[PDB]
Symmetry: none
Subunit: 513 residues, 2 copies
């Protein structure tokens, strides 16, 4: 036949992208368009759903146009996948086809008072009351609470609910609705699991929770899998229908973290990925049955290939200050000037020589949620240098994931098979070695680092028959796009002593108030 | 018609100085010569006693010569005083007049085992067992224990004992021997009070403690006051006898910290001085009656002018890492480039904004004595910067001073009417201010900073009639050498709160072992 290509809309917190992959899973064209970060009051954050929609469209037409110019064999896009900042929630009207307000972002803290109210007046003091249904604690992040808040506080949303015309939806749902010309009102299992309205075990809306939270099941879209025919692109808001040329289907939708889980090929229980960004997000595949957490971790859907096909579940954990710690050392503390020196300063010394640096700046998340913990350094002497402090910060990040992973191993009754990394800090070689050594598993660094975008591309491709099974997907990746591999290179005396030092250090962190 | 001159040899840890003062207490010639800091094993420090002797002689020869050029009539120095790093101990031979080995320094930790063996076998587990005799706990610093080591470890010293030719002394005794040709084997009360071998109230060698620790009294110098004839300079080591031109008497000997107390005119009880340098010490004049300590602090002789003169006593508190702390931030952490950036960055913020830096790099001294304490910072957030960390360090220093003064008031039964400062960090205004605001008293700063050297010249000039009395001495100082006063400026609640913050941070310093 001819060459095939799959497009991936990568819709993030600070920008939107379109990446076209070829059938070897190589990114052959990209365009990025940012969008405005609206901040009406301290701790609020909101996005313009229409601005986001036009960025997607822009990106699609620019990347397309750039590829035609450099690839004589590119004829059309076979299918489009979507991946998105999760939890961000949009309200819009079924007949005007427009938003009723801006979109509160995942990390938006306006829903706080609703969240304290729900914990008390519905869970009787327990934030975990519905964690066996949803997999989730009561929290400001999850969508129901933002939905509730827009019902309570946006007269326009209240009204349209009463007309029977209101649509709520995560960014996947919204993007798919407009791309479709308003014909498709859908969502995938991974986005739907971050709403607080889906029953993990069935992956359907929960009549009980919707009732109990007073969100009407008329407002919610149809839950579908990650990989299947969602709709077609039927708009032309920035040249896009012209650019795609043929009608082009939408056949992949997956929340960003799960999209990275998928794009890093974590198809089997025990396989986990970590993104080393500003924070860390670690996800492990735990298998075909939902596993619930007794360490404060999130249970979520990992991925679902095919409608009502197999559903792999996952456990998710975070740390707030990974990349942010490195940036803090530089710009607040002058411990170095630009990012290259971070790793070389940390390599200049054989170890931390006693010190521990717990970068608990905005508390400890992970499996020891403690908002009172603060940034603390212990063990220093006159022989202590910035080299050691920088190295200890690398150890700290790796120690936290280790704790997170330890908790996941216990909640799930599995061992960690391998950890794939992506993110800025995955380019710090030393941090990968300290991590491999602590976890006692191989760490895998793909050199094609666009793993989030690839997840959604893989979903669309499987469904459109560009790739014909997960095994073919792994073969192509392992052959074409080369992984760097990083084996444990440390003794069990050192491992055990580093974790013991860390354990002792964590006791000394309590400070705020 | 012509100016009368007094000489001071200032034999410090890292160098030797000779200062010549006029009868108006102005330094008119100075010369300085550094000596080698030998460190055979880790935590060991050791000096070459011939190097030290010869350094002092070069200092006298050159300072003398530089003065003749400024003043061609100067025919002689009236008298020469000695002040010296204390506790540092020389072993020598009565007839060869030469060191048997190198001299272990005040902060040398080779005596550690011997320090334990003593606390148990002689002291029944109590380190304060001779507190009421010596004014001291059992510790690595004091000269007896170094004496003991050289008998158990140095063939030449163990041996020279047998023949009746072994001499031991502190650096005063050693300089003063060699300066005199061998004709003088003496020590002053302040230096003697640091041997662990002298009764504080009586200023006698204690036959009980000698006996107990296996130190034969045959090796020990005759104790004198700080102000009287010790001997004459009768050597030509660098033309020194010649340069002096006349037989010049040594009429001053005083341990370095006491010398600063004396040189800052701290004659009344409640008057205290805080010195920064190769080590950092606060000394309070407590009066004619000796006071002992319930809160770590050391009891010692302040000074005694003359054989039949009254003995004024003092309490002594140390801190271990003071100027070292600033240089550590500079040289190890790169928090600033040069010394003037420190006070500025610290000034650029309103406060510590919730952080505390306990700079206990080598344990907590003062009234806490915790050798397990290490350097620790607590409270940090992403809003913490180097300005806060540097400011915090300065607060820690004042906070430690404050806790040391607290202990001193309780022990002595007095308030601190005045604190005079000198050494390095006295040039930092912000620190002086933070210090004044915590002790709630005045801080005096000499423009004629050379006050340690002054003390021994004052001793030697009092004995030789250059000044006739303590009153004339203080009258001239006031007349000649200008002050700078720093007054408190804060609340009771600022103070109370900063101290409670500090007291909780201390709980989190235990780390070593
Ligand atoms: O890890 N984070 O806190 C985080 C994650 C995503 C962000 O934005 P994005 O990288 O454009 O999706 C910004 C910050």
């Amino acid at each position: 036949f001819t060459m095939k290509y799959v497009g991936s809309i990568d819709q993030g917190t600070t920008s939107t992208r379109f990446i076209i992959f070829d059938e070897r899973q190589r990114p052959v064209s990209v365009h990025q368009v940012p969008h405005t970060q609206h901040t009406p009051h301290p701790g609020w954050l909101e996005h313009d759903p229409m601005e986001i929609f036009r960025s997607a469209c822009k990106c699609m037409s620019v990347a397309i146009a750039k590829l035609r110019q450099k690839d004589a064999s590119f004829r059309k896009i076979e299918a489009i996948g979507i991946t998105n900042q999760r939890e961000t929630t949009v309200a819009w009207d079924r007949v005007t086809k427009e938003p009723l307000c801006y979109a509160p972002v995942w990390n938006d803290l306006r829903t706080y008072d609703i969240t304290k109210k729900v914990t008390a007046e519905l869970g009787g003091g327990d934030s975990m009351f519905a964690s066996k249904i949803t997999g989730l604690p009561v929290s400001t992040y999850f969508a129901a609470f933002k939905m509730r808040w827009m019902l309570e506080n946006v007269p326009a949303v209240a009204d349209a609910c009463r007309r029977g015309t209101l649509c709520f939806g995560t960014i996947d749902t919204w993007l798919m609705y407009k791309l479709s010309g308003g014909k498709a009102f859908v969502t995938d299992v991974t986005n739907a699991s971050r709403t607080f309205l889906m029953d993990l075990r069935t992956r359907k809306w929960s009549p009980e929770l919707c009732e109990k939270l007073k969100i009407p099941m008329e407002t919610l879209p149809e839950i579908r899998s990650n990989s299947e025919l969602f709709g077609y692109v039927e708009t032309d808001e920035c040249g896009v229908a012209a650019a795609l040329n043929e009608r082009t289907p939408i056949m992949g939708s997956i929340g960003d973290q799960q999209s990275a889980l998928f794009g890093n090929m974590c198809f089997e229980k025990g396989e986990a990925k970590n993104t080393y960004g500003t924070g860390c997000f670690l996800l492990m595949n735990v298998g075909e049955e939902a596993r619930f957490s007794k360490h404060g971790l999130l249970s979520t859907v990992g991925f679902q290939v095919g409608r009502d096909g197999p559903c792999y579940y996952a456990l998710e954990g975070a740390i707030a200050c990974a990349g942010a710690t490195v940036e803090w050392m530089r710009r607040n503390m002058n411990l170095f000037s630009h990012i290259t020196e971070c790793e070389k300063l940390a390599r200049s010394v054989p170890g931390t020589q006693g010190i521990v640096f717990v970068p608990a700046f905005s508390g400890l998340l992970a499996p020891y949620w403690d908002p009172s913990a603060r940034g603390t350094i212990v063990g220093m002497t006159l022989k202590t240098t910035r080299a050691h402090v920088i190295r200890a910060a690398l150890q700290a990040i790796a120690l936290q994931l280790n704790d997170v992973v330890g908790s996941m191993k216990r909640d799930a009754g599995l061992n960690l098979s391998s950890l794939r990394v992506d993110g800025g800090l995955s380019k710090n070689g030393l941090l990968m070695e300290i991590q491999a050594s602590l976890l006692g598993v191989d760490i895998l660094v793909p050199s094609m680092h666009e793993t989030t975008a690839l997840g959604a591309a893989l979903c669309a491709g499987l469904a459109a028959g560009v790739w014909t099974s997960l095994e073919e997907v792994k073969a192509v990746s392992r052959r074409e796009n080369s992984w760097k591999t990083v084996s444990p290179s440390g003794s069990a005396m050192e491992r055990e002593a580093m974790i013991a030092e860390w354990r002792e250090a964590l006791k000394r962190t309590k400070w705020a108030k």
